[PDB]
Amino acid sequence: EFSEWFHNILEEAEIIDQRYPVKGMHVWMPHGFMIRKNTLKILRRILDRDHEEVLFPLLVPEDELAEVYWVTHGGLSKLQRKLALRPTSETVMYPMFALWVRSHTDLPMRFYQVVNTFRYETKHTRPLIRVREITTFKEAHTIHATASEAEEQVERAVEIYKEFFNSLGIPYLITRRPPWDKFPGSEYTVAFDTLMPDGKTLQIGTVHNLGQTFARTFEIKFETPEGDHEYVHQTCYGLSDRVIASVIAIHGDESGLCLPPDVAAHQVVIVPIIFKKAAEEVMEACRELRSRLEAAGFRVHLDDRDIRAGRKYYEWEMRGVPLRVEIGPRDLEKGAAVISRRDTGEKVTADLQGIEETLRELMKDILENLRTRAWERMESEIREAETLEEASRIVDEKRGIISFMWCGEEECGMDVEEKVRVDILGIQEEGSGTCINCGREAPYRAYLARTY
Amino acid sequence: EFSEWFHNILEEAEIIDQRYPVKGMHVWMPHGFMIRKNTLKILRRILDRDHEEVLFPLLVPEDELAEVYWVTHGGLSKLQRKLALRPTSETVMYPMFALWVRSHTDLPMRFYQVVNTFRYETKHTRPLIRVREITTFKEAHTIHATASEAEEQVERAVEIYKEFFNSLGIPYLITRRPPWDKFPGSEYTVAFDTLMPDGKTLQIGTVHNLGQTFARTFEIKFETPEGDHEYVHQTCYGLSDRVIASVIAIHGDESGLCLPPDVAAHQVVIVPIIFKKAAEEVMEACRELRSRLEAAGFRVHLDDRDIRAGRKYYEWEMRGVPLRVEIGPRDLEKGAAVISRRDTGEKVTADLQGIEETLRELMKDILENLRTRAWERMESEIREAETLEEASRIVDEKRGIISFMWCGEEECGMDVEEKVRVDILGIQEEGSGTCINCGREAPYRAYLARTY
Ligand SMILES: [Mg+2]
Ligand SMILES: [Mg+2]
Ligand SMILES: [Zn+2]
Ligand SMILES: [Zn+2]
16 A cells, blocks of 8 residues: 555655654654755745744743643752643744834734654654654744734735645645634634545645734734734744655655655766776766756766666666766767656657756656646545535545535534544635535535545 | 853844743844854855764653653653653664664765754853753764774864864864863863953864774674674764854954854845935946846845935944945946945945956955954963963963973873863873973873863
């Protein structure tokens, strides 16, 4: 199944090593780390346009807070106010925000940090999808003057995760979580969901619109042009390692890892073909290619090693390198080489002259291609239902996502869950109809699925 | 004094905010973070030549270990094996290294990670120099086949910290810590020390040469060409935030922060001078300068704002920007502008044509200049002494570093410390003489000082 493929590739391409002396704490190995490093480069290059990165501490006071790991002793000495490994920054980024805000001249403000978080759980240990220590977790907070601009932010926020995701070539379904699932205290939480190969659903990003609710709890006032003092309007949002998890799974494959060009470890890998004849001329030619690519902004690599070229083909291919460039005596003379893709298999033949541009184009192609395929496979698993019994049938038989109309009342909604044993992703305001369950007027389009 | 200058600048240039609800945990603000981000870019660009970055977890088992914060409960449930916030990775990067090594074909190996560490202390809270949570701590570990190559690594390691430090323009004194200070279990630890403005000494980097000592404790064997199994030779080394601390202090100044060009937030800042006359032509000209610099690899900024230009001068100058470029009507016509330095004050006048190169040169200059000055001020605080009473006199009167000859026996050494109330930095094998204390033969050149 998928679950087996997944584990086996993590270990084979050396992404993470699970053999750590504690369940739920995993080690990033060289290759894995590299992919994560490039994934973050993309993310940060977007955020950094109008956001400011910072970095708060790891421990949070028992007091300020009012399944969380607790720090009690400082050796053998019991301390006098317990310290907790950060659940979510809420409790202490805020009190401080109180001190930074004191004039409508200050607002708006947009911060974010990439930190690690903790959650104490049992009976559920799934790699990169559910652990005890979430190594890569980006969270952004924003402060505003008017209740309107808050909502405008929520929109911008969304257009941001779209761009990010589009770059990883990942499909998504944007809805609006039900009030029993929204973020505690928030006005309303919005969610990004994507489909896994095992026909289940993964949450890969949320945007929350708090109110003045927290502003009040922690006292965050700002004096106005009219010389008064009102609380601020704020919003937060974040995404985790799951993003990395999905990029591996979604663009799966039988050969192994297949990755977007700006996420792979190396974009291009140059393999030389030699058999003792003209060896000296082939190499001296492979170099003039690497150094020419490096000094052009290319994450390039040259496999110097002494092994059966056929094997080199295997390794770099299971690992995820997009484009492979082969050089042989024959092609040498003419002044050209062979270029093998990864998403397809097609090996064309281009001239070593304007090769720099041929490669850039091929890269663009590969993404677009991988992206499309991706949406086709998802859209086709979104089926409609009009009778609760029609749902169960489909859920149990074709997994995937299930579309339907819903009244929107709580009870009605929760009973759908208990009968079908599913979770309601969220609404999407659209034309009327009649609820798939209680029959009354249904003013919303909703979704269901089995989730991670 | 220095201590006051320091705090006041941290707050004024918004580097870190100390007002956190716990003593010893501080918050990196936007500006501070930026400096740290660029400091790490330099560091990583060197390490990445022959090292491989990774990332282990934060918690370590009470068992595997055998003033450290302890995690006991998982809510209200007491756990069955306490978890400790990582003192040093030793205890769990190693057991894992055991599994990664199994053939002399595998060695050598060179890893490293940039993580956060913890230490529970009291009565000593000094910003960036001594805290509870060390946010930026780089640590590298290496595994080897022969006991010789281990030592070769120790040498390379050193030549690496030299290059790093030279880039920050920081002076250092390399010695070899005394056996009562070396790293527990190691054969011998080497140290890098630098002088603070308050005439005290700061440790800014160590290199340790463990042996087979740990290899044995954790079982790290590798099978040989001769088909046998011997333990490995390993070495570790690291540096922390102190590095950032020193760069601020060493290149101090009355105006404020003065920084190396590759460490400052912005390398260049363009200020436009306008008074309602030809305003439209001055701006349209300042832009053609920013976009021309950005697309040339320049961390540039344009102060659009509407405020008294004299103030702009103050802000960017207290913050640390190296070069300021001013544009006015007069200079506009001619086709040139004014460029003000930061280390000096000198404002030259160059032509807007080949300005790209004039700036690059000026940057090179500023570093070299700042570096030199730096060593002059340190070397001059290293005074010699021949009688214990001559030491005390100088230490108590001119602070600084004190040179002398030493026999090298422990007792003798420790008694020097207790009588003069100082710490012995380390030896430096050189010609003989007679010990400043016990009179016997002194085969080593040693150093003393009051430290942080
Ligand atoms: Mg639920
Ligand atoms: Mg001592
Ligand atoms: Zn209903
Ligand atoms: Zn002596």
